Amino acid sequence: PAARFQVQKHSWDGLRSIIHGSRKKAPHDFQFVQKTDESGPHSHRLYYLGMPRENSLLYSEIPKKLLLSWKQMLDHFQATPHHGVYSREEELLRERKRLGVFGITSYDFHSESGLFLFQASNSLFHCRDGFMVSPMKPLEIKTQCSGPRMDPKICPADPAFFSFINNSDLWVANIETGEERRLTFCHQVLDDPKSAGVATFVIQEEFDRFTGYWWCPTASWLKTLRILYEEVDESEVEVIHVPSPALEERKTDSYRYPRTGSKNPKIALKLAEFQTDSQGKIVSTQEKELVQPFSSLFPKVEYIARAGWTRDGKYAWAMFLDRPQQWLQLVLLPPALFIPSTENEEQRLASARAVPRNVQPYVVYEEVTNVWINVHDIFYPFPQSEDELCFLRANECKTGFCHLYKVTAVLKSQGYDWSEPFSPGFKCPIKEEIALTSGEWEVLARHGSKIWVNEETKLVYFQGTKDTPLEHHLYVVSYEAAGEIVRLTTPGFSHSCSMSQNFDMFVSHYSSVSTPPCVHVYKLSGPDDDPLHKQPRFWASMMEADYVPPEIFHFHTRSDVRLYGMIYKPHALQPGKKHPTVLFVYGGPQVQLVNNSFKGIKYLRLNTLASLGYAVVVIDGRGSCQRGLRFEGALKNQMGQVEIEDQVEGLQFVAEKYGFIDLSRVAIHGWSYGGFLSLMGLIHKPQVFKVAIAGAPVTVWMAYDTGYTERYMDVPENNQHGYEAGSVALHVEKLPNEPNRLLILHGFLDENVHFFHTNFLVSQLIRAGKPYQLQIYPNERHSIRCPESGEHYEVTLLHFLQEYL
Amino acid sequence: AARFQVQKHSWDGLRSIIHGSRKAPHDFQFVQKSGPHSHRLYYLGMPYRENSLLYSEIPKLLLSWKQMLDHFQATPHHGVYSREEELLRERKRLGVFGITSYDFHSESGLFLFQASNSLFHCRDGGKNGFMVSPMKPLEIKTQCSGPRMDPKICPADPAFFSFINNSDLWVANIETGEERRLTFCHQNVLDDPKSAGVATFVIQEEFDRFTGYWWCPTASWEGLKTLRILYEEVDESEVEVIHVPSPALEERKTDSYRYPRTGSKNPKIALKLAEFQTDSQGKIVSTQEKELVQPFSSLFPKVEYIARAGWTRDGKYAWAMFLDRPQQWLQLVLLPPALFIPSTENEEQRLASARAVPRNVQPYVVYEEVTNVWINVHDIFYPFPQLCFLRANECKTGFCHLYKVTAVLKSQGYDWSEPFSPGEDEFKCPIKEEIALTSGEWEVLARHGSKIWVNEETKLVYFQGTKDTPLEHHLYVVSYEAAGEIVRLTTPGFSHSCSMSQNFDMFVSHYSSVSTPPCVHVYKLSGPDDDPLHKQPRFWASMMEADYVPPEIFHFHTRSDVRLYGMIYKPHALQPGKKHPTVLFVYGGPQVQLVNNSFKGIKYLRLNTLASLGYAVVVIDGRGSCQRGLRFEGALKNQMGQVEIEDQVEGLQFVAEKYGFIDLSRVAIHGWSYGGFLSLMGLIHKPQVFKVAIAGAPVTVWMAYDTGYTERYMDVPENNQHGYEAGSVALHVEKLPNEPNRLLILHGFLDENVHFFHTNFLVSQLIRAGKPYQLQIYPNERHSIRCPESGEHYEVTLLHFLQEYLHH
């Protein structure tokens, strides 16, 4: 009647000016340094990256006795290459981190020497920090190598040295003496498949590891410095072509992209040793391989998740995952199990006979599961004191929730003749395994989340949902006594925190649905006899700050499982009117759109929708993150099948509690996984969703990579019913016959979800005589960087809804 | 309101309409014989399945199409061709599964053709005897690995034949099974840029040549029977490389392509000679690479492309058509076989057999066509025995006409050992005479498979032309001996494609009109032999005879006093006084005429479907059009997209004044290929005129198009800044509508002619200009739609875009 609300129909010029009105990084990567000056006014110096232009190295002065200043470290200077055009290698590392920020995106620091190393321009730069006041020129490190120098790290044992990858080989260089040295020789495209120190595509894109080498923290005495590093051969991995950004050139780029049920790269851990004298020259280098082949020592291993060393460098270590990603073990690798590699079988067996029968790999932990093994970063080894090994470890697999565990595993040597080859199938006795935190909440140990362990006071600081899944909070618990867990961060808000290495101060970037992010400096003051109950006291603020925030709801299901949601309400609502509804979707795992943190930056378009009078509903459904393994396990082997049920469940719930929703004019829209679910919604529930606008969708699972699909959908061989059911390209017969009910968006340069996905869906749509609309983003990969396209993307989104909803 | 309104159909509705609406012998060979049948016409045809080798029996009435091959499938699994052949099939614009091109040797009666994977053959006629039941084709085995492109029988000896395999020339023997390789230019991708016998992408797409070798018609004997082949050696190393998607979509890989974009380096070219000797038993004995005594690029500087090549009928010379980069200077040159020396490793061995070459021997520049517009390449070049020869020459008058030329061959004598730079006309023969056999404001057909047939016994030259009217191809006869009376041999009112017997007694004519479907009538030429010019064409037998309202041809004069022709698809059941919406259908590129007197129903069925729903459809051959001579084609020179939209408006306002059922407030410009390019110019230059544009496979950037097409019309980018920057629709996106639903873009994702980049780059610039757009991909389609399932969709989207949007 007069009840149905009608969005003001605008001209396309009209929508451009509305959207142009819509748009009219905070401190991160923190290094705390104490001033070592009892009489001066500053107790600390915070180092970080931040903006006003580009990201850059900045510092604040923490006083002894309130906004801080952002003092610039670099004497003006530019870390962005002309026109923001990165190298091929650089731009492809910024997609795998979803990095969209120009300038210094990361750095390496050495508190002992004040050495700042960092990739900038198209080379490396460095600076030193007594304590300066005004900025300084960062000295460019001169090379004689050809291409870009990737993944720079300072040698912890000696800051005179540093490392980098160049043409997928490990190099080492001295910043003082400019001397550079290649340590590995795996390269000389497609013709060259071996690489060394490089984290391959699927390792970065789906296992969150980007470096493929690891400094030895200690030198052994000439001194000698080692580096652990993953040797890799992509010879058997399928090869695909994606269009270069240089469209004028009309050329592609080759990738090693292993589709599900395809060979992954052959992998191995190895050592690169080199010696140095008093004056500093690199006197010699040595390639070192495992005394037994990696593939036979650690069989069943498919991806190397993580690796590192003890703090003493006694042993190296590695997190190893099997193909079905249902099995995970941490292995102690002593530096002596590695020999000098050679072609002389005689020379090699004299090194193999010399490796003592006592030295051996110690499998120190193992995680089994019937769902899948999320890779958590957290594995902290305590220096061996009083034959054994004590360590903390975050274990979602034990109880189905990520929690911390202090573990001791016995290191009793079986003994082996390393000259003769053998085939096992090293599991240590666990001496004990104490639960430090438990419960139906969880510990944050993924996507850069970390702990900080003060051994002086015997406390583990961490980050968890203990209070609520809508808010990340900082927690301290003892690792001697598994007793009281003290929360230091204050409710209402979600926090991303950074602890000093002296555990005397923290920073907390925090925000809420209703208020923009702050970045506050809290000191930890109180009795030193009672450190578990240090009170956080606000010391200083580094950052304060048409938008109507949404509000979080919760509701249960016909399974009684609780789900949370957000609603943007139609701005200036007249209770009684029913409004057209846009259902904003993600629905994949490893994401949670619904949490108590300010949404206005990233989801500014959802408020713009609300400002035209659209109901924007957003619902974390079963499969979404932060809620533990059983809640995420809902997707496994049936992707696309469970997620829409909940989205319709939360949609109908929203219509009872809010009653401004017109169930007749609902629309589904998402990118990435969300696009994939926008198209499952229009197949299985077209009586519910009038239109679907699906962006960057996965239309064929068999064309997606192994590391993501197998973990959730298994191997095609074993789960065809699921691959076929969750492949929206095969169910195109069930997509609408009425035109204007489906808009397709895809970034033509997408090397993550390949434009082949839209391409093959349009092919199936044409065969089945289904209409469709299509937008291409010819200068865009999986996400849309360029502001120009963004406006266009949104102007199209508003016009498409206006005319056809 | 008296504004007609098209019925608004649901999407299923339009699918059922298009699906409703969609519910000729060629390559003829005449052979003589004795009982009831005089001849046997061999031909390719697709009897109501796939194109196949057929024969009719010309007796002393409708001819039966007899099967020559027994239960034989000539097309591979479904339509899954090799990559090399299916591009050969796109470059010839070939859309029929089965046998498409075949070779025939009348004396021995040898038929030879590409089929399925390999080569096949079957003898018939001559010394073997005539078949009455379909024959089984014999397989010619191969020790070669890849496909064998471009088979040809050796004219001088039918025991042998040639083929390209892996970018190299091979010769084999059908009898012995003996293969042998003659050219070693191929050893990989960019690391293997050399090739011999192959005609490079552009040659195929722009100069209409799909073979880079040519058999000698004769054999010589030195001191064993020696057979020669002229061939083009190719070096694509310095030619840009581009990646177009495979049709293996699930594979997610591309194919590389040596695509010379305009103002870019072209394949380094050269003519080499390949000799080989056979004995009594036909065993291949020696084989000889040979090459021009002096490099090709110093004997003939300024030559960018080998348009054409071949031999004289006695083999005394090999000839070639040479063309410059601008394409405004063409040459015909004889290359005496004695001008070729065996290629050798040694400086010292190369100067020995150079000293050895007689000074009397040399290349002779026979003919030299200059022009201020551009040289179209014309197939016709008939040398007589002995040098006298017939040639087609557009440049001379501005219309393509036959000329009889005598060239004087006088040697200047050259020291072939010493290195030699020629002067500006170092080899040009004195022309003794040059008589025009044909003249007038009408052209002889000499491109796209048009050919003359010359009867040396009677001194008559048989040709097809536009003499009567540009709307109709006709068969004419004239005498090269006496340039006098031109007798026409084909009925007027129809347009004829025609093929002449080598005995000049019967001819075929496949012909049609706007109003009548195609026929293939066989005609005998009778009349006393006293007078051969005036032999009446006597209808002998038919091979083919015989919803759709055919369109109406008209003509109008421009305000520049130029006569343009158009066509009108009348709105079915037209109520005079109603004003209907108008789909202006466009091409407008050169080398194309759409308005002629021939059946349009098969190719442009959508243009009658459009009419059935009640759209007016208007087709106009603006300037730049073909079949109207060089000054008419020349109108586009360095102005592509500047002259013809005016003509499309001019011919559209006209149709409005004449017929008076057109509604100029609802007109829609729509075309594919160059037509798409005009659609987008039409929406930039005349948005008051055209309310929606649907552009298919459009060229948006000329700087990303090939050299042979673009440089012949638009020059180098460094010599036509304005022209490239005016005729590039991607550079003028600011001038596209701020209003949405006024522009639909279409592009197949495997287009290797116009690269999908062109659209991709327009979409980049649309977005940068903040402009709406619609877009449809064709993921299994290059520069055209072969898969029907796509075609119907395309059509169903054309009706749906027009109905919802082309309004008020």
Author numbering:
A (entry chain B): 20 to 43, 51 to 78, 82 to 94, 101 to 164, 169 to 227, 232 to 264, 270 to 434, 437 to 475, ...
B (entry chain A): 21 to 43, 52 to 61, 65 to 79, 82 to 93, 101 to 227, 231 to 266, 270 to 432, 439 to 598, ...
From the paper:
We present crystallographic structures documenting the N-terminal Met_1_-Pro_2_ of a BRCA2_1-40_ peptide captured in the DPP9 active-site. A truncated form of the synthetic BRCA2 fragment, lacking the N-terminal residues Met_1_-Pro_2_ (BRCA2_3-40_), bound to DPP9 with lower affinity (KD) of 75.3± 4.8 µM, highlighting the importance of the N-terminal dipeptide Met_1_-Pro_2_ for binding to DPP9 ([Fig fig1]). Previously, we had shown that binding of 1G244 or SLRFLYEG, initiates a rearrangement and a closed conformation of the DPP9 active site. Importantly, the binding of DPP9 to BRCA2_1-40_HA was clearly blocked by SLRFLYEG and 1G244, demonstrating the importance of the open DPP9 active site confirmation for binding to the BRCA2 N-terminus ([Fig fig1]). Control reactions contained no DPP9, or included the DPP9 inhibitor SLRFLYEG. These assays demonstrated processing of BRCA2_1-40_ N-terminal peptide by purified DPP9, leading to removal of the dipeptide Met_1_Pro_2_, with the resulting product (BRCA2_3-40_) having an isoleucine in the neo N-terminus ([Fig fig2], Met_1_Pro_2_↓Ile_3_). To further understand the cleavage event, DPP9 crystals were soaked with the BRCA2_1-40_ peptide. Strikingly, DPP9 crystals exhibited positive electron density at the active site corresponding to the N-terminal Met_1_Pro_2_ di-peptide with the proline residue occupying the S1 subsite. Omit map (Fo-Fc; 3σ) of a BRCA2 peptide soaked in DPP8 crystals (C222_1_) and in DPP9 crystals (P12_1_1). There was no trace of electron density for the rest of the peptide ([Fig fig2] and [Table tbl1]). These structures with the di-peptide captured in the active site clearly document intra-crystalline enzymatic activity of DPP8 and DPP9 resulting in the hydrolysis of the BRCA2_1-40_ N-terminal peptide, and release of the BRCA2_3-40_ peptide.
